[PDB]
């Protein structure tokens, strides 16, 4: 059935003495496919992943996790990146067994090889607070590289294309995710504002003000909520082309 | 007194020991007390600047070249440009190509070792640093909101009316959330803005940039975190109330640097193109056209 998380009827709040920040959630995330969760700013996008991770409390609803029940090892990189005062290698490995081939495959997935070349002692430099300060796109790529290396089989991603250009975002789009991530069949959820990649989505869930709108596929969004489909056509400005 | 010295010799040696231990702390503080200044005093006499110098932009880039520190390679090479007072020039380029160091050079933050980049008659190196960074405005890529309240995080000086704050937030498009917020005004923003979402933090710091009326207003990647819909709404509400004000935009997305007055692409520290974006689209072999092509 490949139902990764079958949260149904969920109602999630930040404040226990507050309104539910997320309303009724009935998402049906599949396993082994890329899915883009899209809303405006401040409409529950990161709050949904924090809900499915169990970090936010719920007043009702029932999460249905699935393994290969309880939530397994799921890799995740937040909006704000978080670093360890260690080497870049130890930051990306994150207490995993070392593999020189896959550390290479993620260093050319994330394309941090000129940055490790400009790094004054290469792989063994202390970064973070007690260490050399980085630019920020570098830290973002580090936080997604440690998510790549993790062997999670279910990975969560917040937006890595905050502090990247067009080239790094496309290199992270073509290589890395859907290339290193789907040949190993790793379930990936990705929130983004760059709508030019929701073409490459096996599933999309819409969201507005803590409420999810209808979920499904891109041909399903060609049918359902045509206001949102023409809004995504006009926003991507490839309005002549039909998005599939 | 022999009983006294048997009582107090351990106290003498132990108090000497942790006296030396606490003396190490004063040694570290005195080691940080002798750090360098930043030369906040300007060369020009403060009466000789106008009350309203930035009434025109009129920014010339006269052979600017900057480094971070003196042991480093120069970040920007020889660059040569001129900026109209009313125009809406945007800047773009590959990451690590000095486009934020450009903005630091506009605020005399990165080390300027060349350049005559005088803005409306007064020189940058001659200007007092507090008068310079008091009457310009940069918005950053990282939302770095402090603790405290709405009005404190928006205007820590309490130098404006609340209607101006409501207007600068209206052109920041946060009134629906902050009006539904139970404080309304002076609701608590936590230590770092973690109470709100990330792009909401970016919109908050954009609103704090909006309250300062400076007539020179450079933007870094300030739409890099917000969604494209509210980016288009913010883009169509900016350059309408900010029509006279000169904007210098580092656009994270090309589809707002398309509608512009001039554009500079920057790679390897130097200007590659400096003209209208519309003719750069119709060059058919340009870095701007390949940028918008790889975009969409
Ligand atoms: N730490 C928090 N405490 C209280 N409320 C929060 C917190 N984080 C988010 N919220 C509320 O949830 C809403 C959605 O924020 P979320 O966690 O989804 O980040 P996001 O919307 O994905 O980030 P952005 O859109 O800025 O990239 C916000 O409007 C905010 O009101
Ligand atoms: N604090 C710093 N000290 C020394 N060098 C820096 C510092 N910050 C940035 N640099 C260097 O200056 C170059 C200019 O890049 P920068 O302007 O920071 O990014 P972008 O060009 O994407 O805005 C970078 O390649 C970086 O290596
Ligand atoms: Mg978020
Ligand atoms: Mg920058």
């Amino acid at each position: 059935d490949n139902c990764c998380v079958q949260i149904m009827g969920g109602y999630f709040t930040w404040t226990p003495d507050g309104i539910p920040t997320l309303s009724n959630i009935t998402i049906r995330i599949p396993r082994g496919q890329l899915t883009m969760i899209v809303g405006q700013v401040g409409c529950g996008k990161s709050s949904l992943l924090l809900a499915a991770l169990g970090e936010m409390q719920k007043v009702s609803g029932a999460v249905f996790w699935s393994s290969l029940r309880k939530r397994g090892p799921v890799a995740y990189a937040s909006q704000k990146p978080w670093l360890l005062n260690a080497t870049v290698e130890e930051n990306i490995i994150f207490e995993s067994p070392f593999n020189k081939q896959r550390y290479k495959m993620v260093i050319e997935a994330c394309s941090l090889q000129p940055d490790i070349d400009i790094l004054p002692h290469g792989d063994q430099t202390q970064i973070g607070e007690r260490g050399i300060n980085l630019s920020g796109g570098q830290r973002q790529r580090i936080s997604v590289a440690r998510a790549l290396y993790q062997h999670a089989n279910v990975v969560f991603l917040d937006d890595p294309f905050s502090a990247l250009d067009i080239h790094l975002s496309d290199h992270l789009m073509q290589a890395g995710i859907l290339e290193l991530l789907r040949d190993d069949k790793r379930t990936v959820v990705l929130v983004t504002h760059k709508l030019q990649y929701l073409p490459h989505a096996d599933w999309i869930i819409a969201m507005k003000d803590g409420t999810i709108q209808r979920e499904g596929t891109l041909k399903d969004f060609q049918r359902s909520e045509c206001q949102l489909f023409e809004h995504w056509k006009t926003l991507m400005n490839r309005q002549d082309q039909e998005l599939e | 007194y022999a009983l006294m010295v048997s009582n107090y010799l351990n106290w003498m040696v132990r108090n000497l020991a942790d006296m030396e231990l606490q003396l190490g702390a004063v040694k570290r503080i005195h080691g940080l007390l002798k750090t360098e200044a930043e030369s906040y005093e300007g060369l020009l006499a403060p009466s000789l600047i106008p009350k309203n110098w930035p009434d025109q932009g009129k920014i010339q880039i006269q052979n600017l070249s900057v480094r971070y520190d003196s042991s480093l390679k120069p970040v920007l090479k020889h660059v040569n440009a001129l900026i109209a007072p009313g125009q809406k020039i945007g800047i773009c380029g590959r990451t690590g190509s000095g486009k934020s160091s450009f903005s630091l050079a506009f605020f005399r933050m990165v080390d300027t070792f060349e350049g005559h980049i005088i803005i409306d008659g007064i020189d940058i190196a001659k200007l007092p640093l507090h008068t310079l960074r008091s009457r310009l405005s940069i918005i950053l890529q990282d939302p770095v909101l402090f603790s405290g309240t709405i009005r404190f995080n928006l205007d820590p000086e309490r130098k404006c009316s609340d209607s101006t704050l409501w207007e600068a937030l209206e052109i920041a498009q946060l009134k629906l959330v902050v009006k539904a917020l139970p404080g309304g005004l002076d609701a608590i923003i936590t230590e770092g803005g973690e109470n709100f979402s990330q792009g909401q933090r970016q919109l908050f710091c954009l609103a704090r940039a909006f309250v300062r009326k400076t007539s020179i207003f450079i933007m870094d990647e300030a739409t890099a975190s917000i969604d494209m819909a509210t980016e288009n709404i913010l883009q169509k509400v900016v350059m309408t109330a900010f029509a006279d004000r000169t904007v210098v935009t580092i656009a994270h997305r090309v589809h707002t640097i398309l509608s512009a007055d001039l554009v500079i692409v920057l790679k390897r520290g130097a200007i590659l193109e400096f003209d209208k974006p519309e003719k750069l689209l119709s060059r058919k072999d340009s870095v701007f056209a390949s940028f918008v092509r790889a975009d969409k």
Side-chain angles (χ1 to χ4, degrees), chain B residues 68 72 75 94-101:
Chain B
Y68 266 93
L72 277 74
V75 192
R94 205 180 270 270
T95 44
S97 56
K99 65 191 76 57
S100 52
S101 318

Side-chain angles (χ1 to χ4, degrees), chain A residues 4-16 18 20-89 91-95 97-116 118-128 131-132 134-240:
Chain A
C4 201
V5 173
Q6 194 181 359
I7 168 66
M8 296 287 141
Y11 276 99
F12 299 91
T13 178
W14 278 109
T15 318
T21 308
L22 293 151
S23 68
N24 196 357
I25 305 307
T26 40
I27 66 169
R28 206 230 64 94
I29 179 72
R31 277 214 320 272
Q33 286 189 341
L34 173 48
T35 299
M36 303 207 175
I37 175 68
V38 167
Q40 284 178 144
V41 51
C43 313
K45 311 180 299 305
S46 312
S47 312
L48 201 75
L49 306 184
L50 296 195
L53 261 298
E55 287 270 13
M56 288 175 66
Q57 82 278 13
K58 47 180 180 179
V59 289
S60 88
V63 194
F64 284 83
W65 269 95
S66 45
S67 45
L68 274 301
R69 279 177 155 175
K70 262 182 177 179
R71 168 185 63 86
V74 45
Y76 163 73
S78 170
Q79 262 154 5
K80 164 203 56 175
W82 163 81
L83 264 71
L84 279 171
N85 274 308
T87 78
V88 191
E89 192 189 342
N91 265 275
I92 300 169
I93 284 175
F94 209 87
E95 314 274 356
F98 175 72
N99 184 18
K100 196 253 172 180
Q101 185 44 246
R102 271 196 45 92
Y103 176 52
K104 203 61 69 185
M105 282 176 77
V106 303
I107 212 64
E108 283 105 20
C110 75
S111 61
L112 273 165
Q113 194 56 43
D115 299 309
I116 204 73
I118 207 56
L119 216 49
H121 312 81
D123 212 2
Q124 309 305 102
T125 78
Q126 291 294 292
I127 55 181
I132 183 165
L134 296 149
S135 158
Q138 319 181 296
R139 314 183 68 173
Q140 179 86 257
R141 280 172 296 152
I142 283 155
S143 46
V144 308
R146 83 153 52 87
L148 288 178
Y149 195 68
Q150 214 268 327
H151 293 286
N153 192 29
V154 170
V155 67
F156 274 45
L157 277 79
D158 210 304
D159 185 23
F161 318 121
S162 51
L164 303 185
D165 49 47
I166 46 168
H167 321 108
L168 295 188
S169 48
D170 186 41
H171 206 255
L172 196 44
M173 192 68 215
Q174 299 308 308
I177 74 177
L178 63 80
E179 169 172 320
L180 166 63
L181 220 50
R182 287 177 58 185
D183 68 328
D184 298 333
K185 201 54 161 36
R186 293 178 66 189
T187 299
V188 49
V189 185
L190 164 72
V191 51
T192 184
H193 313 288
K194 188 168 183 172
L195 317 170
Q196 283 78 19
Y197 294 150
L198 68 92
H200 311 273
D202 301 342
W203 200 284
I204 301 176
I205 315 168
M207 194 179 270
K208 168 167 297 173
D209 315 329
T211 83
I212 48 166
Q213 288 158 348
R214 291 171 62 88
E215 76 181 291
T217 61
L218 187 50
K219 183 51 197 55
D220 179 38
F221 282 167
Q222 191 161 357
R223 195 256 322 159
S224 156
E225 206 177 7
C226 284
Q227 195 72 219
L228 202 44
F229 201 86
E230 63 87 29
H231 205 77
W232 293 349
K233 283 174 84 167
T234 47
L235 259 51
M236 286 165 72
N237 313 278
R238 49 185 302 171
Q239 311 178 6
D240 49 341

